[PDB]
Amino acid sequence: LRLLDHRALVCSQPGLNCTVKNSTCLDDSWIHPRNLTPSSPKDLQIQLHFAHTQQGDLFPVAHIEWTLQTDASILYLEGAELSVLQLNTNERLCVRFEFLSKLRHHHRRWRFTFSHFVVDPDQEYEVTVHHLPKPIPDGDPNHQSKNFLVPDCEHARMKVTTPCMSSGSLWDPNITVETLEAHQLRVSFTLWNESTHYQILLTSFPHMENHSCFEHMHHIPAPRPEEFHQRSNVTCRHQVQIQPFFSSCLNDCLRHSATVSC
Amino acid sequence: LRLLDHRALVCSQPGLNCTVKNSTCLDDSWIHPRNLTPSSPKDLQIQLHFAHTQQGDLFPVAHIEWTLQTDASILYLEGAELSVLQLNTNERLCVRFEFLSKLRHHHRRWRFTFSHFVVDPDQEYEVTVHHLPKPIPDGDPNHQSKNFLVPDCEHARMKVTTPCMSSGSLWDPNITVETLELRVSFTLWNESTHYQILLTSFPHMENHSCFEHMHHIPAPRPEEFHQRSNVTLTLRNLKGCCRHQVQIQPFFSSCLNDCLRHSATVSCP
Amino acid sequence: PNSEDKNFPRTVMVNLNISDYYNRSTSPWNLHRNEDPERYPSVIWEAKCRHLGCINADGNVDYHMNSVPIQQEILVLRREPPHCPNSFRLEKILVSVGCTCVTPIVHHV
Amino acid sequence: PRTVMVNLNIHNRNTNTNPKRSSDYYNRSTSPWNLHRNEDPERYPSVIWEAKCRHLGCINADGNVDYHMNSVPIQQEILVLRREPPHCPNSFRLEKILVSVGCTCVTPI
Amino acid sequence: PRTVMVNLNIHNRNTNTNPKRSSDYYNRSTSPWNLHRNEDPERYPSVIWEAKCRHLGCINADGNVDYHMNSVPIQQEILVLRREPPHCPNSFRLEKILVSVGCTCVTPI
Amino acid sequence: PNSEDKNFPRTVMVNLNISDYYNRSTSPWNLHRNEDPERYPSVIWEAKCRHLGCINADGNVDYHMNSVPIQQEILVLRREPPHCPNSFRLEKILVSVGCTCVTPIVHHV
Ligand SMILES: *[C@@H]1O[C@H](CO)[C@@H](O[C@@H]2O[C@H](CO)[C@@H](O)[C@H](O)[C@H]2NC(C)=O)[C@H](O)[C@H]1NC(C)=O
Ligand SMILES: *[C@@H]1O[C@H](CO)[C@@H](O)[C@H](O)[C@H]1NC(C)=O
Ligand SMILES: *[C@@H]1O[C@H](CO)[C@@H](O)[C@H](O)[C@H]1NC(C)=O
Ligand SMILES: *[C@@H]1O[C@H](CO)[C@@H](O)[C@H](O)[C@H]1NC(C)=O
Ligand SMILES: *[C@@H]1O[C@H](CO)[C@@H](O)[C@H](O)[C@H]1NC(C)=O
Ligand SMILES: *[C@@H]1O[C@H](CO)[C@@H](O)[C@H](O)[C@H]1NC(C)=O
Ligand SMILES: *[C@@H]1O[C@H](CO)[C@@H](O)[C@H](O)[C@H]1NC(C)=O
Ligand SMILES: *[C@@H]1O[C@H](CO)[C@@H](O)[C@H](O)[C@H]1NC(C)=O
């Protein structure tokens, strides 16, 4: 989990004076509870957006938008805490909205947007907004939570993001499997611009059977920089698959397979 | 819709002074809105209790329980409005819980009760608690409504209620039909209203009426109140038409014509 | 003598921006006139069931059904004080609107 | 006329509540209807429970829907009070709306 | 020691979060699991997402559950900061609790 | 050294109220000892996947499946200032708990 940039995060809207702060996900209100607390947020909504940084890199971003309620508890609202929790690895990224001015007018509905949380592809997070001050012990929740599922590089727009390109989401192996005599197989494929080794896996299944009677591994060494994209070749159902070893996916990349019948 | 009794309705609890007041269901907040409004009630529950009265009358009441949210808007909660609306007939009966002190702490949950709303057997109501002041135009609801289903006279505690006894819930006619060469004997209630005997002859096993006849038992005198009355009826002379249904309809004051009937059937063999 | 909003918190100035079913019904109802010159609406047609039971296909009264009234609580304006052309008071009255045909609840022994 | 005076301390003329005389006919009727809620916070009354006829026909003695007789709604023009937006030279407006309060069975022409 | 001082400015030493190196393995694993959230308002971290093994046997290459191998959770002991009731002399307590992080396929003894 | 509360609001008083999986797994992992005398816990057992693939029934490495680590962010304590057995500082470190076996994503042509 990371923020898009260390730049100034604009968070003040006309009529409000807000401030964005780094947040160790703990809170002073949690340490020191306050008697009078605001209520839960309303209409939490997390969408997927894409942001270009000044360096030309495009990243997926969790665009969060929420709103307040019209009850008078707005008079005791000193801020919000926006937290993103990665579900598999319990990583937390928190950002604190601190309200400098007191929110007393309900003339217009209040809407808060934050679109600087970088999100990894094919991932699942929990996005929560906690209205600070946090409640006293054995009090009402006053926070809102949602689950944000972010698709893989097979998604049409996500195939062009920097994370997906780093793992070779645009890789086109251009496989050619030709059956040469003496039971030989010649397999030719293209190389992506990364100095890492490749795995060729050959499996010889029977014509109609969910088993194998022959397996073979061959290791393609790391190609030289002067051979970044140049094609390379290696000399009854024969299934041959390339597994790359990119630095993004160490051994869990997207494989590319080919099958030859009897 | 009615209140149980006009005694002093007390809502005060330790730490809170309040009065239960009469209120038409058009509040002052609706006419003149105010910016700061409290939160909606939490955990609204409606139960069916049974309450007595000085004359020994047992009535069904709608016990209402609700709780306050823990947010700071309790500083601006000026009270509640409890309303019951009948669905078939849009009848409204509402009372106002007016708080005479500003609830400020949130130590243990504030729980509010009200058990003075007499309900009718076999009815559906909408019971709502509207936190006062009411929301400004184009605002959050700030109220909690729930539907209430009061069962019919067949429910055990329902049956022994005054409204149910009024419609003869404890009345067993004990209809006996004896066929002659038809005498219907039934016991009368203690109300001076006329009774209706409907004698319908169907075929042996066909759902059709091959005969229909009517008899009118006049309103009995008080000396004939809990007595057995017998009526003899002459039947048609046909074949196959042998299913005799004798249905007795009372005309008690509680239900003019839509009362509970009691039927007996005589078959062919 | 009411023409403006004085300090009376519940008296307000309101902008007064104002067929054969009874005869073809199985549970027909007569419309009885209720007229009040001091009320708005002045004339209300209250429904009273034309029969204790309903009317079957043959046109005779069916005694196995109940012709029961459907009523409502409606809002009407009554003059207060009387004879004031532009002073009214809200009122709630129960009026019989229709007659419907219901199956009686029967208890077999 | 164009503008009148209304006292909103609602006088309840439906004071005959001691006699308990009512039942739910939306299931037992030969032309049953579903109750639908109509909520308007900007209107008094804020909630009105109207009727929608369940079928186009009517339930006959066999419990099946006959299609030679029509289920029609009983409609009553009711007076309601509505809160005007704050950009009007009047805070309230009495309106007549059409409300279906029940359903009845009628014979086609 | 019995009582120690904790500076709650949690130092984020997990600095190398910029690389994208992982994914969700609760579906592609030989021993898949469901994610169960554990929430405690009085505890930090408040929400901990634990693993509950989906089956009692793993998944073979055919996709059908094979019961010769066991799905066992990978349990971890993690420090938790808990808010203490006001009658306690120390407002906070450091505890150790067991959480199931994932599930792995093992050969039975 | 610190032993009492102070204007520092985030330095609080805390009461210190304190095996064959790696070898029988289809995705076995070695345990690495991480010893910091200035950190509580003093020893952490990191999990490093033994094989790039998973082991099959025969014990050889299956190249059709991926042995991927399961890691988790945890809270630990560090003495601050150093060598003080009473003053600490909460710290977040990403550590690897285990290794699981996942089927890869294969894109057919
Ligand atoms: C409810 O009302 C009673 C009566 O007015 C309040 O009792 C008074 O409390 C004050 C402050 O403690 C005393 O000085 C008075 O002598 C009390 N009067 C009586 C008659 O007891 C009571 O405080 C009110 N409760 C709340 C929560 O406001
Ligand atoms: C926000 O700060 C500016 C600083 O000059 C001030 O002028 C403005 O009134 C503030 N806004 C509010 C709502 O107080
Ligand atoms: C917030 O955290 C980021 C990442 O550690 C850091 O680069 C930045 O300087 C921090 N800002 C503040 C105000 O602490
Ligand atoms: C690798 O080649 C692709 C074209 O196939 C190009 O889009 C990408 O920028 C290249 N990356 C590097 C690091 O050269
Ligand atoms: C409400 O009004 C009725 C009739 O005027 C009266 O008997 C009753 O005591 C009143 N209740 C309250 C709480 O004012
Ligand atoms: C009903 O009448 C029959 C005969 O007339 C009698 O045997 C029976 O006891 C009566 N039932 C009751 C409850 O009295
Ligand atoms: C009728 O009888 C019942 C008991 O069977 C009794 O409770 C009721 O008071 C009686 N009615 C009258 C008017 O006496
Ligand atoms: C009803 O039966 C009794 C005897 O059980 C008899 O005396 C009486 O005459 C009968 N009623 C009529 C109307 O004949």
Author numbering:
A (entry chain F): 33 to 267, 277 to 303
B (entry chain C): 33 to 213, 217 to 304
C (entry chain A), F (entry chain D): 34 to 51, 64 to 154
D (entry chain B), E (entry chain E): 42 to 150
Lines quoted from the article behind this entry:
The IL-17 family of cystine-knot cytokines consists of six members: IL-17A–F, which exhibit differential binding specificities to five receptors, IL-17RA–E. The most well-studied IL-17 cytokines, IL-17A and IL-17F, are produced by T helper 17 (TH17) cells and are elevated in the context of inflammation. IL-17E (also known as IL-25) is a key regulator of type 2 immune responses and driver of inflammatory diseases, such as allergic asthma, and requires both IL-17 receptor A (IL-17RA) and IL-17RB to elicit functional responses. Thus, IL-17RA serves as an organizing hub mediating IL-17 family signalling at the membrane by acting either as a direct receptor for IL-17 ligands or as a co-receptor.
We conducted cryo-EM studies of IL-17A–IL-17RA and IL-17A–IL-17RA–IL-17RC complexes. These molecules co-eluted in a monodisperse peak over gel filtration with IL-17A–IL-17RA having an apparent 1:1 stoichiometry, with IL-17RC being sub-stoichiometric on SDS–PAGE. The tip-to-tip receptor architecture was present in our cryo-EM structures of an IL-17RA–IL-17RA dimer and another IL-17RA–IL-17RA tip-to-tip dimer with IL-17RC bound to one copy of IL-17A. The tip-to-tip interfaces of these IL-17A-containing structures are superimposable onto our arrayed IL-25–IL-17RB and IL-25–IL-17RB–IL-17RA ternary structures. On the basis of the ability of IL-25 to enhance IL-17RB binding to IL-17RA, we hypothesize that IL-17A binding stabilizes the membrane-distal tip of IL-17RA and enables IL-17RA–IL-17RA dimerization.
